[PDB]
UniProtKB/TrEMBL annotation:
BP terms from Gene Ontology: symbiont entry into host cell via permeabilization of host membrane; virion attachment to host cell
Gene that encodes it: VP4
Example of a GO cellular component annotation carried by this entry: viral outer capsid
Haemagglutinin outer capsid protein VP4 concanavalin-like domain location: 4-161
Descriptive protein name: Outer capsid protein VP4
Full-protein residues shown: 15 to 173 of 213
Compartments (UniProt record): Virion
This protein's UniProt keywords: Capsid protein, Coiled coil, Disulfide bond, Hemagglutinin, Host cell membrane, Host cytoplasm, Host cytoskeleton, Host endoplasmic reticulum, Host membrane, Host-virus interaction, Membrane, Outer capsid protein, Viral attachment to host cell, Viral penetration into host cytoplasm, Viral penetration via permeabilization of host membrane, Virion, Virus entry into host cell
């Protein structure tokens, strides 16, 4: 608990480099929208347990977007939708399956890192960006900030709540 700075209310801001944002989702839909409007876009979308394959409609980066989602599990799913250029389609780059309902985002070096997989064995991987410092995030939920050096405790929160 000594590494948690928060909770903060839903916020639009430029997150600092070298901190995990630990974002607490309390409903289905858009959890956050992050972009630099050049080479990096990520949105995370929450889907509640026991959702039969379906199209759902969202608003991402000011646009109406349809995504095909499925959650036949008893856990929440958090679908990471990525694109690397303005005109590209989104891809479901990674998913987190979790009833802890926390997602993580870290800006570090030339990459943005997140958690994926199924709790309690969720792990991290990354997207590249050549413009880390123009990333703005719209966070639709409460969140906490954890220094990158304390990632082991962030991992524990993702995996255990």
């Amino acid at each position: 608990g000594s590494v948690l700075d928060g909770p903060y209310q839903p916020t639009t801001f430029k997150p600092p480099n070298d901190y995990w944002l630990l974002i607490s989702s309390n409903t289905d839909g858009v959890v956050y929208e992050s972009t630099n409007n050049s080479d990096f876009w990520t949105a995370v979308i929450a889907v509640e347990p026991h959702v039969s394959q379906t199209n759902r409609q969202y608003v991402l980066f000011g646009e109406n977007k349809q995504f095909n989602v499925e959650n036949n599990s008893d856990k929440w799913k958090f679908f990471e939708m990525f694109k690397g250029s303005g005109q590209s389609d989104f891809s479901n780059r990674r998913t987190l399956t979790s009833n802890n309902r926390l997602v993580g985002m870290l800006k570090y070096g030339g990459r943005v890192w997140t958690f994926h997989g199924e709790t309690p064995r969720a792990t991290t991987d990354s997207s590249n960006t050549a413009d880390l410092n123009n990333i703005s995030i719209i966070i639709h939920s409460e969140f906490y900030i954890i220094p990158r050096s304390q990632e082991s405790k962030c991992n524990e929160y993702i995996n255990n709540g």
